[PDB]
Write a protein that binds this ligand. Structure first.
Ligand SMILES: *[C@@H]1O[C@H](CO[C@@H]2O[C@@H](C)[C@@H](O)[C@@H](O)[C@@H]2O)[C@@H](O)[C@H](O)[C@H]1NC(C)=O
Ligand SMILES: *[C@@H]1O[C@H](CO[C@@H]2O[C@@H](C)[C@@H](O)[C@@H](O)[C@@H]2O)[C@@H](O)[C@H](O)[C@H]1NC(C)=O
Ligand SMILES: *[C@@H]1O[C@H](CO)[C@@H](O)[C@H](O)[C@H]1NC(C)=O
Ligand SMILES: *[C@@H]1O[C@H](CO)[C@@H](O)[C@H](O)[C@H]1NC(C)=O
Ligand SMILES: *[C@@H]1O[C@H](CO)[C@@H](O)[C@H](O)[C@H]1NC(C)=O
Ligand SMILES: *[C@@H]1O[C@H](CO)[C@@H](O)[C@H](O)[C@H]1NC(C)=O
Ligand SMILES: *[C@@H]1O[C@H](CO)[C@@H](O)[C@H](O)[C@H]1NC(C)=O
Ligand SMILES: *[C@@H]1O[C@H](CO)[C@@H](O)[C@H](O)[C@H]1NC(C)=O
Ligand SMILES: *[C@@H]1O[C@H](CO)[C@@H](O)[C@H](O)[C@H]1NC(C)=O
Ligand SMILES: *[C@@H]1O[C@H](CO)[C@@H](O)[C@H](O)[C@H]1NC(C)=O
Ligand SMILES: *[C@@H]1O[C@H](CO)[C@@H](O)[C@H](O)[C@H]1NC(C)=O
Ligand SMILES: *[C@H]1O[C@H](CO)[C@@H](O)[C@H](O)[C@H]1NC(C)=O
Ligand SMILES: *[C@H]1O[C@H](CO)[C@@H](O)[C@H](O)[C@H]1NC(C)=O
Ligand SMILES: *[C@H]1O[C@H](CO)[C@@H](O)[C@H](O)[C@H]1NC(C)=O
Lengths: 214, 305, 229, 181
């Protein structure tokens, strides 16, 4: 039951610098190890196979080495287009029961950037629908990690919210996140204050954005 | 052990029970030895379409290096040998005797060319069940070896000279069998499966398919040094044990080389109504029984009392 | 080198079966082996199985053994993937991929495992939910409180199925500063997402903002203007 | 004895049935003893036959006892008798290849002729008979003619060849052009 594992779940590299990706196996695989690059919404791209042979159209800054249960993917000088998710694949066994690593996300590392927090009360049209959705937007920040806490009438919430995050911005390298709190027209029209408490590395202290229902 | 018996015994290498014995024995030495990554065998038990039995199995990289095998008498029988130096399977043998076991036979699966086998003592010998039937295989036995060297690099080497001299001996024996005023032409195979079209065999555990045209393109009775035959190592072949297909793993060694002695040929002549004064011969083979038969032609199993 | 064109998006109820195809063109079809690989939303790649086109033999992943079948019609250079007894966890994008093996037609076969040629992929959504367009609610400009120069505004696309939906602003005239978040699956079984953009507060009152929502499945096409108040 | 008819360019199959459900040695030859097809163990051989790359069999049935001689892309010269020698037997059979052609280019006008010519191997007199889509019938030896074509003749014609009491069908498409007054 050959299992592959990529060391850094996420590699934050500064543009122009080198990046090294790790992939190990729970069992020996000789040199039947390939690497793949995948941009969002695209089919994977084969970079290396046979552990070290660069596949057609793959620039020379990409190189692969290793054998057995420890492999490495070295990108010499990261280019704007080199930022993506990378996967390894062992195709050693027979019968064929090939497997994939869980992937390593290669992300652009930049300076810390606090988010711009905006809260949105539910629209009157939605309130009509018999359900109110409260939206909180944390705009252009870095790093990607961020905590969000809803508080209704100083009451911590949980179970009724769902966060979504965009891909790293290709121009400024920032991320944006959207947290959504849902409730039926009832519950909503039963409370006064609705707050979106945010926590980030770029923020000296938690920034809270709230509105009073009405 | 040997015991010269004084009496007239009758032989027939085209109906020699021992051959089928060897045939099934070898097929077994193979099956436990050379294992495919997958084999496909037909199966059209009437019904509508045809079901295909497919096996996917361990595919360890190994080579076939069988130890010579001696066949002794099976419970209830005895082995008779035709001591005559030049005897062609079919016919009576005057100089016959009882033996304990056969001489050591180096089992070799291959086509067109018989390797590492016994050599004819006197002149060259050519056997068949019916030289008249152009569809019957002609088993040629040499009195002199000829080394064939092959490499996993893509070729097999053979003395342009030795091979030449050996062909002269063959056409000599041939025109003799058909017509003195006849001309013997040696052309390449007429076609069919890859294994049959080319001199096929297994070296260092790999399957070779070597183009033998250069060896069969000559006419007789009507610089220069080595002959290089282009080979090819395949992973997908046609099985010889039975109608089937097999796939093997790619080579792991960069230095595969084998040396063998060509000691016999499997020919087939293009009969038809050519109505000329020339016969055309081509490399044949496929039925491994002819291979076994080329070594067993001098024995027979006999129910003893 | 061959081109892998996959069949269109599939929508099925749990328990159903699907048959996705992949058209190969550009080279000798039987000289390649094909593999199917799937990826659930937000997850990695999962190898499903591979077929040796030449031999017409195929091998599958263990957890998949049983309800999966990969085939190929050497006449139409097409590879097929069939999945029986569909499950909700089977929802994922199914990738068809191939690699050159040598001259199989000549008995050469390297039995390559890596994958060089890939297809665009086929989305296959397995769910109990029924098709339906989204509702579109405005995320009115924060020109109520927040004190600054740039304002945030957008649209909330709620309760739709199945993916995907596409969102533009001003018929595509507005793109700068736009964040159309990935969709989330609500416990109701229907998707939801918001599309936003930060714009010069001064632009409000004079510049009209319109988010265009397009949902191919339900054939829904909506436009919602977002006013200050 | 047995007679088999084949269409030109088509693929005819000539069977051979052993006695047991085993895979024994067999081979086909022509009237002049030329090796066409045959087997050597589990492998297939082909002979000096002028039908070399157009000849084949079905090894899938060998284990069944059937070793058919399948000749494709039929030519008329392939017409001749073929023998299947197996387990010391001789299942002989005569082959007859036919070809039928409309001397003219389908797109014809009302009032114009249609001439169908049949291709038959020397020494063989077949009876031809085609049926126009409307029912117009024509019978003949080597050539068949309809002196004046009607609009209702547009469509698929069906032709039948009679030789040695056997027959084969030919679907020839034709197009007669309509016009206005
Ligand atoms: C084939 O090689 C012959 C001699 O090779 C012998 O076997 C190899 C493995 C070595 O051990 C070597 O010392 C032996 O002599 C040649 O006589 C022969 O000419 C070669 N084949 C050709 C090209 O005809
Ligand atoms: C041998 O050649 C003829 C018989 O063999 C045929 O040769 C040519 C015509 C090939 O195309 C094929 O038909 C046969 O292989 C005889 O008629 C001729 O007399 C013989 N001697 C000659 C002139 O070569
Ligand atoms: C394969 O062929 C056998 C014998 O013809 C048949 O019984 C079987 O149903 C077929 N498929 C299977 C189950 O392997
Ligand atoms: C060889 O075969 C011939 C064919 O009949 C036979 O006469 C002869 O006895 C056999 N053995 C000898 C003597 O070479
Ligand atoms: C067999 O070899 C001998 C020499 O070993 C040679 O004289 C003889 O001619 C060969 N056989 C024939 C006659 O073809
Ligand atoms: C022997 O050869 C002839 C000519 O081919 C023919 O009778 C048959 O093939 C064989 N049968 C005999 C006579 O043993
Ligand atoms: C063998 O000798 C030469 C090759 O060295 C060849 O051309 C010729 O045909 C042969 N001579 C004979 C018949 O012995
Ligand atoms: C090699 O064999 C091929 C097919 O087997 C044939 O077409 C060609 O003429 C041969 N060439 C050589 C090496 O003589
Ligand atoms: C005839 O045989 C020779 C070898 O002696 C070979 O090189 C050649 O390819 C064959 N026919 C020709 C001239 O192509
Ligand atoms: C038999 O073959 C070996 C190599 O396989 C070779 O060295 C030896 O000389 C050959 N025997 C003869 C007949 O000389
Ligand atoms: C016998 O032939 C085999 C090929 O099957 C070869 O590998 C071996 O070296 C030969 N044995 C001798 C005499 O060296
Ligand atoms: C065999 O020949 C010898 C000749 O000395 C004779 O004495 C003996 O009786 C013969 N036996 C046979 C074969 O009947
Ligand atoms: C083998 O040939 C010899 C002559 O060399 C002959 O006396 C004998 O009859 C033939 N076959 C046998 C041993 O019967
Ligand atoms: C067989 O007997 C013959 C005649 O008695 C004799 O010439 C020959 O040497 C014997 N063969 C052997 C050694 O077994």
């Amino acid at each position: 039951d050959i299992v592959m594992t990529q060391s850094p779940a996420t590699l934050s590299v500064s543009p122009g610098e080198r990046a090294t990706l790790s992939c190990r196996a729970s069992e020996s695989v000789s040199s039947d190890l390939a690497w793949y690059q995948q941009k969002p919404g695209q089919a994977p791209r084969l970079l290396i196979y046979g552990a070290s042979t660069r596949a057609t159209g793959v620039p020379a800054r990409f190189s692969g080495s290793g054998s057995g249960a420890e492999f490495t993917l070295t990108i010499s000088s990261l280019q704007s287009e080199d930022f993506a998710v990378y996967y390894c694949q062992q195709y050693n066994n027979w019968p064929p029961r090939y497997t994939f690593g869980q992937g390593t996300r290669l992300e652009i590392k930049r300076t810390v950037a606090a988010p711009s927090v905006f809260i949105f009360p539910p629209s009157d049209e939605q309130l009509k629908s018999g359900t109110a959705s409260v939206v909180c937007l944390l705009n252009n920040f870095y790093p990607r990690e961020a905590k969000v806490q809803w508080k209704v009438d100083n009451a911590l919430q949980s179970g009724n919210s769902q966060e979504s995050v965009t891909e790293q911005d290709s121009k400024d390298s920032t991320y944006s996140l959207s947290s959504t709190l849902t409730l039926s027209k009832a519950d909503y029209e039963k409370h006064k204050v609705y707050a979106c408490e945010v926590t980030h590395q770029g923020l000296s202290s938690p920034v809270t954005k709230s509105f009073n229902r009405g | 052990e040997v015991v010269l018996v004084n009496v007239t015994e009758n032989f027939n290498m085209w109906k020699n029970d021992m051959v089928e014995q060897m045939h099934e024995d070898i097929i077994s030495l193979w099956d436990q030895s050379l294992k495919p990554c997958v084999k496909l065998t037909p199966l059209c038990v009437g019904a509508g379409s045809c079901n295909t039995s497919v096996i996917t199995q361990a595919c360890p990289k190994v080579s076939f290096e069988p130890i010579p095998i001696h066949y002794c008498a099976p419970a209830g029988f005895a082995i008779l040998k035709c001591n005559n130096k030049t005897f062609n399977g079919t016919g009576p043998c005057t100089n016959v005797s009882t033996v304990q076991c056969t001489h050591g036979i180096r089992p070799v699966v291959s086509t067109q060319l018989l390797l590492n086998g016994s050599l004819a003592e006197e002149e060259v010998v050519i056997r068949s069940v019916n030289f008249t039937d152009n569809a019957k295989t002609i088993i040629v036995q040499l009195n002199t070896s000829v080394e064939i060297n092959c490499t996993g690099a893509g070729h097999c080497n053979i003395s342009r000279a030795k091979w030449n001299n050996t062909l002269k001996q063959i056409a000599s024996k041939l025109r003799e069998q058909f017509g003195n005023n006849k001309t013997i032409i040696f052309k390449q195979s007429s076609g069919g499966d890859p294994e049959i079209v080319t001199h096929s065999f297994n070296c260092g555990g790999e399957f070779f398919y070597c183009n033998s045209t250069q060896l069969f393109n000559s006419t007789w009775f009507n610089g220069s040094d080595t002959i290089t035959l282009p080979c090819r190592i395949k992973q997908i072949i046609n099985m010889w044990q039975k109608v089937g297909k097999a796939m093997y793993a790619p080579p792991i060694s960069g230095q595969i080389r084998c040396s063998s002695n060509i000691t016999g040929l499997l020919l087939t002549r293009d009969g038809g109504n050519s109505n000329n004064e020339s016969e055309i011969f081509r490399p044949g083979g496929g039925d491994m029984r002819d291979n076994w038969r080329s070594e067993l032609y001098k024995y027979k199993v006999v129910k003893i009392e | 080198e061959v081109q892998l064109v996959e069949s269109g998006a599939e929508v099925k109820k749990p328990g159903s079966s699907v048959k996705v195809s992949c058209k190969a063109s550009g080279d000798t079809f039987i000289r390649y082996s094909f593999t199917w690989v799937r990826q659930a939303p937000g997850q990695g790649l999962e190898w499903m199985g591979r077929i040796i086109t030449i031999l017409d033999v195929a091998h599958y992943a263990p957890h998949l053994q049983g309800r999966v079948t990969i085939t190929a019609d050497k006449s139409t250079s097409t590879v097929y993937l069939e999945l029986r007894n569909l499950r909700s966890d089977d929802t994922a994008v199914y990738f068809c991929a191939g690699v050159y093996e040598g001259e199989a037609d000549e008995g050469e076969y390297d039995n390559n495992g890596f994958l060089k040629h890939w297809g665009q992929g086929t989305l296959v959504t397995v769910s109990s939910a029924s098709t339906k367009g989204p509702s579109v609610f405005p995320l009115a400009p924060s020109s109520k409180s927040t004190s600054g120069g740039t304002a945030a505004l957008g649209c909330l696309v709620k309760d739709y199925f199945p993916e995907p939906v596409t969102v533009s602003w001003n018929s595509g005239a507005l793109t700068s500063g736009v964040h159309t978040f990935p969709a989330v699956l609500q416990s109701s079984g229907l998707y939801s997402l918001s599309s936003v953009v930060t714009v010069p507060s001064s632009s409000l009152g004079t510049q009209t903002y319109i988010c265009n929502v397009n949902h191919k499945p339900s054939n829904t096409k909506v436009d919602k203007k977002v006013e200050p108040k | 004895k047995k007679v088999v008819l084949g269409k030109k360019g088509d693929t005819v199959e000539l069977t051979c049935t052993a006695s047991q459900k085993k895979s024994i040695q067999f081979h086909w030859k022509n009237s002049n003893q030329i090796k066409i097809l045959g087997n050597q163990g589990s492998f297939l051989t082909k002979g000096p036959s002028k039908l070399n790359d157009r000849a084949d069999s079905r090894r899938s049935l060998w284990d069944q006892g059937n070793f058919p001689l399948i000749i494709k892309n039929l030519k008329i010269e392939d017409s001749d008798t073929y023998i299947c020698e197996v387990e010391d037997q001789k299942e002989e059979v005569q082959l007859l290849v036919f070809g039928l052609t409309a001397n003219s280019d389908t797109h014809l006008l009302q009032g114009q002729s249609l001439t169908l010519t049949l291709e038959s191997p020397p020494g063989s007199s077949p009876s031809v008979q085609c049926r126009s889509p409307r029912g117009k019938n024509i019978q003949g030896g080597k050539t068949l003619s309809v002196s004046q074509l009607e609009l209702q003749d547009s469509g698929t014609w069906t032709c039948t060849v009679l030789q040695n009491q056997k027959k084969v069908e030919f679907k020839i498409d034709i197009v007669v052009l309509a016009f206005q007054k």
